[PDB]
Design a protein around this nucleic acid. Sequence first.
RNA 1: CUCCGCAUAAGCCUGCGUCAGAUUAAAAUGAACUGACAAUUAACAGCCCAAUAUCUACAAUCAACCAACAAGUCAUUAUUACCCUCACUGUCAACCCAACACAGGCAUGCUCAUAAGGAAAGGUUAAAAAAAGUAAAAGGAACUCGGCACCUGUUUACCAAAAACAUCACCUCUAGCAUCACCAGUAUUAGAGGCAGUUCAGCUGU
RNA 2: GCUACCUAAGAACAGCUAAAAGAGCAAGAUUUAUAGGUAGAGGCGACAAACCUA
RNA 3: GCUAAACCUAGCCCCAAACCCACUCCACCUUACUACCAGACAACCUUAGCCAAACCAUUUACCCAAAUAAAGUAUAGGCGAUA
Lengths: 336, 394, 214, 181, 46, 124, 102
Amino acid sequence: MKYMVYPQTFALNADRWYQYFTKTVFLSGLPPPPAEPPALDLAALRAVACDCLLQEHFYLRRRRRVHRYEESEVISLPFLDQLVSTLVGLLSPHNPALAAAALDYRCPVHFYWVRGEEIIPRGHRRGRIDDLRYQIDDKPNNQIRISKQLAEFVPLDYSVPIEIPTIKCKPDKLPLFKRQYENHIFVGSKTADPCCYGHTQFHLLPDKLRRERLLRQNCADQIEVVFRANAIASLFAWTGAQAMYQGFWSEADVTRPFVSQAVITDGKYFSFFCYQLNTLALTTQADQNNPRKNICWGTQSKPLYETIEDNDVKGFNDDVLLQIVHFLLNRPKEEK
Amino acid sequence: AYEWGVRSTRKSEPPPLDRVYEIPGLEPITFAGKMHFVPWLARPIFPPWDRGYKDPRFYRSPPLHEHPLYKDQACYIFHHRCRLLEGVKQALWLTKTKLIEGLPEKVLSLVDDPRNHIENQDECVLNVISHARLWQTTEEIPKRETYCPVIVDNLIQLCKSQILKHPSLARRICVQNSTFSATWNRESLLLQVRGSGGARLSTKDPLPTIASREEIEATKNHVLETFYPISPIIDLHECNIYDVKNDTGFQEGYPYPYPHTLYLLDKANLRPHRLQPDQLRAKMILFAFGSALAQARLLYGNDAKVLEQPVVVQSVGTDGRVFHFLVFQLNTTDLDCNEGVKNLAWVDSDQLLYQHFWCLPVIKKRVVVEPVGPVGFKPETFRKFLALYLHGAA
Amino acid sequence: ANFVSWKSRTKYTITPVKMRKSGGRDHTGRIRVHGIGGGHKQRYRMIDFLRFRPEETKSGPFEEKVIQVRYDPCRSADIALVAGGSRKRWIIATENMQAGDTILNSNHIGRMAVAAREGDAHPLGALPVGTLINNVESEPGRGAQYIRAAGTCGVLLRKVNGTAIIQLPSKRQMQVLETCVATVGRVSNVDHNKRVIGKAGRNRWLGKRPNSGR
Amino acid sequence: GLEEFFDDPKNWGQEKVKSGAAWTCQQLRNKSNEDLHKLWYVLLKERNMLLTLEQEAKRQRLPMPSPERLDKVVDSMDALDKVVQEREDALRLLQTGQERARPGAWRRDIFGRIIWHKFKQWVIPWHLNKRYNRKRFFALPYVDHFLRLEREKRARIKARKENLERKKAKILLKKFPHLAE
Amino acid sequence: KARGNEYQPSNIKRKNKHGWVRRLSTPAGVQVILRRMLKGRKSLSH
Amino acid sequence: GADRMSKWTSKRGPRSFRGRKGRGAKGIGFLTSGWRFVQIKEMVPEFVVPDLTGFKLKPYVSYLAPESEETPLTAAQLFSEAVAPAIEKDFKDGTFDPDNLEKYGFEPTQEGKLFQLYPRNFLR
Amino acid sequence: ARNVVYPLYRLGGPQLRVFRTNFFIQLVRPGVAQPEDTVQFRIPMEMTRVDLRNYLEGIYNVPVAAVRTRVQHGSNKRRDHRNVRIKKPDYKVAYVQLAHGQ
RNA sequence: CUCCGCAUAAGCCUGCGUCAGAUUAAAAUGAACUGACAAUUAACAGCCCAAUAUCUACAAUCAACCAACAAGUCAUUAUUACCCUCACUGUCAACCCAACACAGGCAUGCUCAUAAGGAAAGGUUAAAAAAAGUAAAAGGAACUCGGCACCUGUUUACCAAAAACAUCACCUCUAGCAUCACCAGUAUUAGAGGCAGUUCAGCUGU
RNA sequence: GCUACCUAAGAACAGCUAAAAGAGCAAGAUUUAUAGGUAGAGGCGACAAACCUA
RNA sequence: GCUAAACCUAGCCCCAAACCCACUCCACCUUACUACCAGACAACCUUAGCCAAACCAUUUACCCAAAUAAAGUAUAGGCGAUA
Ligand SMILES: [K+]
Ligand SMILES: [Mg+2]
Ligand SMILES: [Mg+2]
Ligand SMILES: [Mg+2]
Ligand SMILES: [Mg+2]
Ligand SMILES: [Mg+2]
Ligand SMILES: [Mg+2]
Ligand SMILES: [Mg+2]
Ligand SMILES: [Mg+2]
Ligand SMILES: [Mg+2]
C-alpha cells in the first residue's frame, strides 16, 4: 500500500505537504544565471505565439459547440501542443540540442519512492514498522527529452537557511489515499531509449482547478499553491526517475544534480519552475544524517494575454513569451 | 419475402378496447379519476401529452422531413469512416482524376542529392520506429492506437529539423482537428466530402504546380474507367438533410490557409476496423481532392471552369507500418461531365517503412534467434516521406 | 429474466449480428430439443433469399457482382457478398461462384428457354426443362426455402400450364407456379458430406452436447 | 465566527450556568414573522452551542453543565415552529380551504389496507410514469380472508384488554372495600 | 469433501430471490407477506 | 445466514448496491456522459439568514414574566383581525361588493404565486 | 432541511430557499491529529457538504475553503437483556478547512 | 517455521484502537466479553449519456511472413437540441461459507521466496499398548486373498483393471417447412434410435 | 447461493518432447468467478436410476 | 452445611354486551422503507384426497338465516356402510 500523490491536486496547501514528501525547499524567482566569462527574432516568435492563440480561439472552425467545461481540452490543450511544437522548430537553429530532442505528447511519468516510516495502528500487524511509500503518476501535456544532461543550477552540496516544511498529522489528512498497484519509475520512455534526460515539461491545469472555480470556493490564496504543487511533484518525479535511470537510488545517492524545467499554465496564466534533484536518500535510514536538500525555483503566475477579441489578441506579454524561449534555449554543456 | 424481426420481440398489440366505447351516447367510467389502474374499471384514453417547454436532457427532435435543411434530392457524403467498395477506381471516377503510378520527378528530385538528407537519417529513423513500437509506454507491446499516431508525429518532427538548412520551413504549421467541406456534382449526382481526422500541414504559400499545361491537356484522351453493376456512390452516406456549403476549415485571415499536406492515420487495433490498402488510398484521393476543391472554390468562386492556376495538395496515409503517398493536382472544377480536362493524381502505394518489429527477443531452444527492433527496415520509404515534406520549401 | 429471442433486428444489414444460444430450451426455459448446448460463439450474417429484389427506386432485372465468397458458421453452404448498384447483401453461393463474377437476377419469362448460367436467378418457367436449380420458393415472392443446403440441387422436370414440377433433393415431386424465381446450379460445398468429424471434441465445438435417452 | 459554537469563555468550567425560561407559544404568537425568523437563528446558534457542549462533556467523561438549557432551547424552537405553522395553516384554510399542505388521497394497497397516500412531485403525468404504474393501489379477492383474520386478531386483543380492566377493578374493590360506590 | 457449506452468500441473489419486490410480484408471494403480517413477523421479507 | 433484522444501508451489498443507495440527502443536480455531475445552483438550498444586529430577543425569557393563557391561532381569528376591519369599513361606506374579494387579500387561485399555500411549493 | 419535501425544480425555475433550517450541527474535538486549519463537525445525515459550507458561511460567517464528509457506522453489536441488538446510531462526520489561512 | 504473504472482488458489519472493569481465555500481562470514548475524509470505486434516421463483409494470436477453423469482445455519419459543473455513496477489523482435532471450501492481481506473515514443546518422566518416522545382520515374496518397479471421452475404482454410458465413423427411422425451441435452419438439413502379457532378473521389515 | 444441465457476458493454465497437440511427462469433451433460467403428476441427468440446500 | 426449597402475581380462558382498526413530519411495490421522466403485467374457471364400508372400485363431511317439535319419520343407498 502506497500514497497516490497527484501533482495536480485539489488539497489545500498541497505544496507544503509535497515539499516534505520530496524533501524539497522552494525559492521564489528563478535560479541564478549560469555564470559565463544568430539573433533572436522576437517579432517572429510573438507572431507564432499569436498564430497559435488565435487558431484555436478564432480561425479554426469547430463542427460542434464548445462548452465551458470542454474549453480546457478543446482549446487550451491543442494550443499548448502547437506552441511547443512550433517554438522548438523556430528555436532549433539557436539551440542545436532541440534538433535531436524527443518531443512527447501526454506521455506518462512515474516515480516511486519511500519517505519516512509509520507504526501500523490496527490489525494483526499493529505495532510493526512500515515504510511510507509514495507514487506519482503524472501526464504532462508536453515534455522534451534530450540525450545529454543539462547543467546544474547550484552545486550538489548547495545549502540554504530555509527549512523544509513539516507535518504534525498523517499524510492522509491532506487528504491523501493509499492504494496498491504497480510501482513504476518512468521518465516518459523506457530505459532503452537514449533520450533519458529531461529538458522542459509543459503542464495544463485541469478544469477542476480553474482560477474561476477557486475564487468562488474561497480559495484565492490557493491559486499559486496549485501551480507550486504541480511543479514540485512533477519535476521531482521526472528528475527522480532520470536519476534512477542512471542507477542511483536511496542507498546509492546521486553523484551529480539532476535538473529539469517546467512551464505550468491554465491556458492564459503561465508559471515557470526549475527543479534540481540533489538527493534520493529519503528513507529514514538513508536520510538520517543527510544534509542535501532538493531545490525548486518558481515564479508567480503571469497572464500571457489579457483578452482575445475576434482575431485580435489584446495584452500580449512578451516577458512571459521570452521566459518560455529562455527555458527552450537551455542546452547541455558541451565537452572540451 | 422473409421479414426481419420475430413477432415475440415486437411490442405487444394494444388490448381490445372496452365495448362501452362502441355504444353511442355512453361515457365509459374509467379509473382516470382514481389516478391509478384498477382491473374493474375501463382503461382511460389519454390525450397526447406535451411537456410545454424545452428540456435539453429530454429533447425530442421533429420529423426528418420537417427539418429546415431537408431536401428532396439526396446528397452522397464521403467522410473519414466511408469505405469504398471499388477503392481507388471509385475515387478516380468520383473526382474525375487520372492516376499516375509513382510520385512526380520534381518531388523526388528534392531528396535525390545527399545535401538534403538528414544526418544519420537511417539511425534517426530507426530510433523513431523503436520509440513508437517499444519504448513509448510502460506497456510491453504498445498498440496501433498509440504507436501509429506517435510514429507519424515523430517522423514529421524529424523532417522539421531541416529548418536550419531550409529557412522556408518556418512558414508551415501542423494543425489538428481541422475539418473541410466541398460539394460538387458528378453526372448529375450531388457529392460532398466532409474531411476530419488526421493532421493538416499548412503553409503560408501555395504549392508549385506539378504538371505543365501540356500534360494537363493530354488528360482529355484519358477515359475514366467505370465499374458495372456497382454504383459510383456505393458506400457513401446518402443524406437528405444537408447544407451545400464549401468550407476550407478556417475563417478569413488565417496565416496558413493553404493545405500543404494531409496526414491520415489508420489507427485501429482491430483489423476489420482498419481500412484496406486500396480503401485508404481512396480516402486520400477524396480528402486531397476535397481540400483542393475547397481552396479553388474559395479563390476562384463557385463557377465550374478549368482552373488557370491549378491547386496541388499532398496526402500521406499510414497504419503505422505501411505508408501511402499521394500528390493531387486540381486542374478543373468542371466536374459534372466526364469529358474534358481531368485532375491528376500521383500515387505511390504499399511503401513499407519496415517489414516487422520484435518487441521481445525470439528464443528457440534457449537461443536468441531474433533481436528486438525493426525488421527489414527500408530507408527508401522515409526519403519519399521527406520529399513530400521538403516540397515547396526546397 | 425470461427468454427473449435474439432475432429482434428489423432492418437488413450485412454486418454480422450477435447471436444467443438456446441450449435446446424454449421460451419456458425447459428443454425441448436435446443435445444442443455450448459450442463456439457465432455471429449471424443476414442471408437474402429473395434473389430477385430490385432496389427501392429501380425496377426490373438487374445484375450483381460477387465481391467475396466465404465460410458461414450458421449453415453448411458457403455464402457470397454481392454488390449491385449501391446495395450489398448476402446470398447463398453456388458450386462455382467466385469473387469478381457477375450474376443476373431477372423476373422475365422469355418466349423460349434462356441459356442456363450458374448463379443466375430466373423464373422457373423461364429456366430450361431439365436444369439443376437451387433456392426455390413455393410461392411467387415468398423467398427461397428449399434446396438451400450445401451441394443440394433440384431438377426442373417439366413445365405444364403455367406451373413447374421440380424434384427436391429427397426425390419428391413438387409443383409450383412458373413465376417462382430459382437459382441455376448446385449449392456450394458439394464435398460437405465427405468431411469426417473424427474427434468427439469437434461435436462440442459445433454446439452439440451429449444426449442420453436412457 | 467559530467561537459562537462555544459558550462565553467565562462560563467554561463553571458547574452551572443560570438561564431564563423557555419561550412559550403565547409569547411567540405576539411576535411578528420577521421577529420569529430572527429568533429562530438566535435559538439555532444557542442550540448548536449546547449540542457542542453536550458532546464534549461525553468526550471528557464529565457531566454537562446545566443540561436543562438544551431542554429549554428545544422547547422554544418547537414552540416557534408551532406558532409559525399555525399562521401558515390558518392562511391556507382561508385562501384554499385545504386542511393539509401536501396533497394526498385515501387509497387501498396491495394488502387490502386503507392508507393515506401522500403525493410526490413529478415532471411527467401519472399515466406515463413507468415506476408509479407498477404500484398496485388495489387488492384482489385473495386478500379478503386475511383481512378477516386481521380483524379477528384485533378483536381478540381488544376483548382481552377490556376483560383485564374489569378484572383489575374487581381486585381493587377486594383490597379497598369502601370503594364500592 | 466440504460439508454443510451450501450457503454461498450473495446479496444480489438474496434480494432477487426473497426480496420485497419479488414477493409482491406474484399473488402467492403477496400471501406470503400477508401470512407473516398476520403472525406479526418483525421481518416480512429480505 | 444473512442478517434480516439489521437496517439495510448503502454499506451493505456489492459495489453496484453501495453506489446507488444514499443516506437521504437531496439531489442537487444530475449526471451527464462520462459520469460527470452537473450541479444546478437553483436546486442547492439557499439559506436566508437575517441581520441579527440590534436584535433584542434572546434565547431565553426572564422568569419575571406574566404567564398568559394559551390561545392557538385559528382561521376565524386571523380573518377577524386581518380581513374583517377593511370589509366593515367598506360595508358602512357601501363600496364593498362581493365581486371584489381580492381587494381585501383574497386569492382566487394559487397559480402564478412564488409561494403557493396549496400544494405547498416552498421550504420551511 | 430534513424530513420536509423539497419543491421540485424545473429548468428555469426560482431559487430554492430555506428560511428556518432545522439542521443542527456539533463542533467536536478530533479523535486523531488534524491540520491546524481543519475543523471537525457532526452533522445530520441529510446535510450535504454544500449545505455545510453555506450553513457555516451564511449563519456563522466562517469562510470555508474545503468540506469533506463521511458516514460513520454505529455499532450494532450490543445486546440488551432480551438478547436483542442495540443500535448505536450512525452519524455523518464533516471536515471543514478554513479559508484565508485561518 | 513459512504452509505463505500484501491487495482487490465477494461476503461480513465494528468483531485484539483508547479508558475502565469485579467479566473472560490454561492464564488471580492479554482480552476477540462488558461499559464509555474515538474512528474509515476522494483523486480509487460505485453512481452515467437528448432525439430521429443512418452506418458497421475483412478475427485473435508480438500480426509481419508461412497458415488455417471451432469463424471470432471492441468502429459511424447526417440534421436537430444543449453554456454547467465536481453532489451523493463504499473506504474500520485479527473478518467470509463451514467444521467444531482446518475436517475443509474460497475468484483475481502481485511477490516466487519473501522486505511480508508465523511458533510444532504448560511442567516432568522416558513403562506397556498405540500412531508416524528413521536405521537394520543374513535372506529377499519365502508365510501370507493379493507385494513394488470401433476412434477417443466421462464414470465407480485407481497402478488400475472391468463394465457402463458418451461418441467419431456406420446403420435404419420420421419430416417438403419459416417469424419464441428445432431455426432466423431447409433432405450434403433436422430429430429420433441402434451400433458386440507373464515367467525371469532386481529391490524391499510383507 | 448445494448439485445437475443450460443462457449471458468474463477469467485462468509453468516447463519439458514440442512437426502433431496432447490429461505425453508434468489449451481441453478443461477448470473457474458473476448474474440468470429449468420445480416435485416436475426438473435435470456422457443413466449411478443419480442429483434437485438432510 | 451447601446446592436448593418455598411464594402470587403477570397475564390468560370461557361467556355476555357492543358491528373494529388506522393520514405529527419524513420514507416505503426499484435491491420496500430509495425526493425528481413517455406507462401499458393485469383479477374472475367444480376443492381435492380422505375420515368409513374393518380391502377397495359407486358410496360418507365440512355453508346459505327461528330454539323446540314434526323426526332419525318420509326418502336416498354396492338398498351395504351410511346419508
Ligand atoms: K464483519
Ligand atoms: Mg467519500
Ligand atoms: Mg473517479
Ligand atoms: Mg482498506
Ligand atoms: Mg516477519
Ligand atoms: Mg505451541
Ligand atoms: Mg505435555
Ligand atoms: Mg535387512
Ligand atoms: Mg506365495
Ligand atoms: Mg522376484
